[PDB]
Structures are given as C-alpha cells and as structure tokens.
Amino acid sequence: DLLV
Amino acid sequence: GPLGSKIVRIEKARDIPLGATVRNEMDSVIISRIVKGGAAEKSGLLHEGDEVLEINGIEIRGKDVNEVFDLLSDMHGTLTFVLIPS
C-alpha cells in the first residue's frame, strides 16, 4: 500500500 | 463523535513520513500498516483498520490515497485527524  | 469517530492530533514534518501505509476500501481511506520504527508507532496514535474521515478539516472520504499523500506533502505542523477506529 501507499506510505504516508 | 460523528460516525463514532475520534479526534487525534498528528505531527507532520516536511519530508518525514508519518509512518503508516493507507489503502482505498470502496469509498474510504483505511490505514493498513503501522510501520515498525516509524513516527506513527512511536506516538501510538494511529492503528491498522482506522478509517481516515478528515485531515485538517478536509473531507477524505472518496479521495484516492494518492491525493491524500499529495495533501499531506503540502502540510506541516500539528494536524487534526478524524478517525473511525476498527
């Protein structure tokens, strides 16, 4: 998934 | 709170990740992982399964995680996260  | 949400204050530093990964689930943004050794683990404030409803007064439902990343890349300081715990 996308790291923030 | 609304939809059973809670208000959490999250520190954001330019060029430093919060330390959580997010995914889209239907029309929601859900936290999928709390990265070991990252800032989110250290603070204890974000958790897997949390749904992000708002970030500093901006409604997040319906937004692509890419837009969430872009939004956060344009913000710094103490941010107000409205979350639904899982």
Author numbering:
A (entry chain G): 208 to 211
B (entry chain B): 250 to 335
What did the original publication write about this model?
Importantly, the SARS-CoV-1 E protein’s PDZ-binding motif13 sequence allows interaction with the host cell polarity signalling protein PALS1 (Protein associated with Lin7/MPP5) thus interfering with epithelial function and integrity, a property of the SARS-CoV-1 E protein which is thought to be important for its virulence. Examination of both the PALS1 PDZ:SARS-CoV-1_E and PALS1 PDZ:SARS-CoV-2_E complexes showed that the E protein PBM peptides are bound in the canonical ligand-binding groove formed by the β2 strand and helix α2.
In addition, two hydrogen bonds are formed by Val271PALS PDZ –Leu74SARS-CoV-1_E located at the second β‐sheet of PALS1 PDZ. Furthermore, in SARS-CoV-1_E only Val75, Leu74 and Leu 73 are involved in hydrophobic contacts, whereas in SARS-CoV-2_E Pro72, Val71 are also involved in hydrophobic contacts. A comparison of our structures with apo-PALS1 PDZ reveals that similarly, both SARS-CoV-1_E and SARS-CoV-2_E binding to PALS1 PDZ trigger rotation of PALS1 Phe318 out of the ligand-binding groove to allow binding of SARS-CoV-1/2_E PBM. Our ITC measurements revealed that whilst PALS1 PDZ did not bind to MERS-CoV_E, it bound to SARS-CoV-1_E with an affinity of 29.6 μM, and SARS-CoV-2_E with an affinity of 22.8 μM. However, despite the sequence differences between SARS-CoV-1_E and SARS-CoV-2_E PBM in positions −5 and −6, affinities for PALS1 PDZ are comparable, indicating that positions 0, −1, −2 and −3 are required for CoV_E PBM interaction with PALS1 PDZ and define binding, whereas positions −4, −5, −6 and −8 do not play a major role.
